[PDB]
């Protein structure tokens, strides 16, 4: 039982990181309309609090977070990412957020040290 | 002299990663225009060529490659990458590639095993 708890603590759980990214997106962006001047601030925020919440977990993971914000104008959006690592320890999480005005896709990567 | 050569071999060189990304995009996308249904194939080909060349490098790092493809129809573009690793041996490279009607942004991360 203790080994299972240790593995869970040391593993990159997708659900908690997804909740972290969702909360970061909600806090930084919210229901605000699209503004080209605010893309830098929103992306930098989302990244910063996503990293802060990932680090507050205490897991020995090198956290990589990327954020893309794009206005909705009928343009198709596709985000694909393939990587190679040790699938036993490292994990990834893809979260896509959208509203009436812009798209938002944030990817958080947790890699064991 | 030998130590410097070994360090260069075990260092994540940004220039060669950028060259690999450019070659992968050119061989996978090239002069072809944007097509919404074909974005999946272009992103997949770019990322797999990048990963294959990066593995053929043989450096002892774990790699993350994300390829993103856009339409040039007034959609705002901005990519920011702030993460948490050990900066002494791990690095990242962001390469922006564009043509008359198409955007393709690819980011590569390499982290020490």
Swiss-Prot record, chains A, B:
GO-annotated biological processes: cell division; establishment of mitotic spindle orientation; intracellular transport of viral protein in host cell; microtubule-based movement; microtubule-dependent intracellular transport of viral material towards nucleus; negative regulation of neurogenesis; nervous system development; regulation of G protein-coupled receptor signaling pathway
InterPro entries referenced in this protein's UniProt entry, alphabetically: Tctex-1-like, Tctex-1-like_sf
Domain of life: Eukaryota
Modified residues (N-acetylmethionine): 1
Subcellular locations according to the entry: Golgi apparatus; Cytoplasm; Cytoplasm, Cytoskeleton, Spindle
Molecular function terms, GO-annotated: dynein intermediate chain binding; identical protein binding
UniProt keyword annotations, A-Z: Acetylation, Cell cycle, Cell division, Cytoplasm, Cytoplasmic inwards viral transport, Cytoskeleton, Dynein, Golgi apparatus, Host-virus interaction, Microtubular inwards viral transport, Microtubule, Mitosis, Motor protein, Neurogenesis, Phosphoprotein, Transport, Virus entry into host cell
Modification after translation: Phosphorylated by BMPR2; the phosphorylation is abolished by BMPR2 mutations in exon 12 which lead to truncated forms of BMPR2 and which are linked to primary pulmonary hypertension (PPH1) [MIM:178600]. The phosphorylation status is proposed to regulate the association with the cytoplasmic dynein complex and may have role in cytoplasmic dynein cargo release.
Expression sites (tissue/organ): Expressed in heart, placenta, skeletal muscle kidney, pancreas, spleen, prostate, testis, ovary, ileum and colon. Expressed in lung endothelial and smooth muscle cells (at protein level).
GO CC aspect terms: cytoplasm; cytoplasmic dynein complex; cytoplasmic microtubule; dynein complex; extracellular region; ficolin-1-rich granule lumen; Golgi apparatus; host cell
Keyword Cell cycle: yes
Segments for region (Interaction with GNB1): 41-113
Subunit structure: Homodimer. The cytoplasmic dynein 1 complex consists of two catalytic heavy chains (HCs) and a number of non-catalytic subunits presented by intermediate chains (ICs), light intermediate chains (LICs) and light chains (LCs); the composition seems to vary in respect to the IC, LIC and LC composition. The heavy chain homodimer serves as a scaffold for the probable homodimeric assembly of the respective non-catalytic subunits. The ICs and LICs bind directly to the HC dimer and the LCs assemble on the IC dimer. DYNLT1 and DYNLT3 compete for association with dynein IC (DYNC1I1 or DYNC1I2). (Microbial infection) Interacts with human papillomavirus 16 L2 protein; this interaction is essential for virus intracellular transport during entry.
Similarity annotation: Belongs to the dynein light chain Tctex-type family.
Known role: Acts as one of several non-catalytic accessory components of the cytoplasmic dynein 1 complex that are thought to be involved in linking dynein to cargos and to adapter proteins that regulate dynein function. Cytoplasmic dynein 1 acts as a motor for the intracellular retrograde motility of vesicles and organelles along microtubules. Binds to transport cargos and is involved in apical cargo transport such as rhodopsin-bearing vesicles in polarized epithelia. May also be a accessory component of axonemal dynein.
Name of the protein in question: Dynein light chain Tctex-type 1
UniProt organism field: Homo sapiens
Upper classification of the organism: Eukaryota, Metazoa, Chordata, Craniata, Vertebrata
